[PDB]
Design a binder for this molecule. Structure first.
Ligand SMILES: C#CCOc1ccc([C@@H](N)CC(=O)NS(=O)(=O)OC[C@H]2O[C@@H](n3cnc4c(N)ncnc43)[C@H](O)[C@@H]2O)cc1
Length: 396
């Protein structure tokens, strides 16, 4: 790779390495409960062995219908360790949408919990249902499994909206992001990282593995904490959280003077205004992160430090091992200042859309610039600036 990363390693392999180096460090926090890296890893291994016994294997797609919680993360890690990929199904989606995802994904096994069992019943799911807080796992072996794995194996299928489509992401993209987070944000095991997004929104993937592939601690925010801006600020300050990713629409309601310990604020998913950036960029490192679900994150713009106010907010430059092409309708490259479609190549590109071969071929085209690879057509309008940053301009 152009930029070094842990090539050849799976997500759970990278997590296991952190658990070996930082066994007694806090890995995950939810309300009054927490687990160390060693405890989290052992519990994930016990559940992974149960999942293997039930038949989970390479490119098994496993539904997860759970409340955000420590146990939710145990389940994700266990699916990966068993060799499968997870499909997160937010339990607050409407019943019609849950049923569509279950049917489209063709998953034969759904991981849930006692408080969600009735919803699994009421959506009519006829596959295998594992109620995790009814399974007896404590007696199972806790060592790592070392199942066969390749970086090109599926890691997760996340649905977006035509009809919702299951976007298929492999391990390699997240391995590259481990290296990106450590190089570009300087993430270390000392960091304390909040988890804000729904597990059905791929921001949550970034947040979870930003912590757990670096030895840092992951603080899963409760619904009560998110629902009250003052409670959110108090939680971040009392727990001395150092990194958080937010929608700009949430950030606009927060008070910088009430957050004590953040060193990085990332916004993602929509544009931040220049006045919002100006309000935060001198209190901490403000980062605008852009990307489609089809590659998680594609570009970032960190507001340059110790500079006067900005009047606009670029989406920045491609992250490591990722390439941006701004092209016309004939996929020809445009010069600086010309508006065109933002297209993406790189190690984090999705495999495509689950059981949508024509749509996949339409959106993941042959990369004209790198023979043998694919390039994703985002439908986003953009242009280059002469300083080499990109301006997001809306939809084509
Ligand atoms: C470090 C770190 C993690 O960083 C990220 C960054 C982006 C993502 C996205 N995958 C989140 C997202 O919104 N995905 S989405 O599929 O629901 O929507 C993608 C579209 O949203 C818009 N978008 C998306 N980020 C922007 C933007 N920063 N400005 C302005 N429009 C945007 C563009 O239209 C994208 O094509 C996740 C993690």
């Amino acid at each position: 790779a152009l930029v070094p990363y842990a090539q050849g390693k799976s997500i759970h392999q990278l997590f296991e390495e952190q658990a070996e180096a930082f066994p007694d460090r806090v890995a995950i926090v939810f309300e009054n409960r927490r687990l160390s890296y060693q405890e989290l890893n052992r519990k994930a291994n016990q559940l992974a062995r149960a999942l293997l016994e039930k038949g989970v294997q390479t490119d098994s797609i496993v539904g997860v219908m759970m409340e955000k919680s420590i146990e939710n993360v145990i389940a994700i890690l266990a699916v990966l360790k068993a060799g499968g990929a997870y499909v997160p199904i937010d339990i607050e989606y409407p019943r019609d949408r849950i049923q569509y995802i279950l049917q489209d994904s063709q998953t034969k096994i759904v991981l849930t919990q006692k408080s969600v069992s009735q919803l699994v019943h009421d959506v009519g799911y006829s596959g295998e249902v594992v109620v995790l807080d009814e399974e007896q796992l404590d007696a199972r072996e806790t060592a790592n499994l070392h199942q066969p794995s390749k970086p090109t194996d599926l890691a997760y299928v996340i649905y977006t909206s035509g009809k919702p489509k299951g976007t298929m992401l492999e391990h390699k993209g997240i391995a590259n992001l481990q290296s990106f987070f450590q190089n570009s944000f300087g993430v270390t095991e000392q960091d304390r990282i909040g988890l804000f997004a729904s597990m059905s929104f791929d921001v949550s993937v970034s947040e979870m593995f930003m912590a757990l592939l670096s030895g840092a601690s992951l603080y899963i925010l409760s619904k009560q904490t998110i629902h009250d801006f003052a409670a959110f600020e108090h939680y971040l300050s009392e727990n001395e959280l150092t990194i958080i990713t937010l929608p700009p629409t949430y950030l606009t309601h927060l008070t910088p003077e009430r957050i004590t310990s953040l060193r990085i604020m990332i916004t993602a998913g929509s544009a931040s205004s220049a006045p919002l950036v100006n309000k935060w960029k001198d209190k901490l490192r403000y980062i605008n992160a852009y990307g489609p679900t089809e590659c998680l994150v594609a570009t970032i713009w960190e507001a340059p430090s110790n500079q006067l106010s900005v009047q606009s907010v670029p989406i920045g430059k491609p992250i490591q091992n990722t390439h941006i092409y701004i092209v016309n309708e004939d996929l020809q490259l445009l010069p600086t200042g010309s508006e065109g479609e933002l297209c993406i190549g790189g190690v984090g590109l999705a495999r495509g859309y689950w059981n949508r071969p024509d749509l996949t071929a339409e959106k993941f085209v042959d990369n004209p610039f790198v023979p043998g690879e694919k390039m994703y057509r985002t439908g986003d309008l953009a242009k280059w600036l002469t300083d080499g940053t990109i301006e997001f301009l809306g939809r084509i």
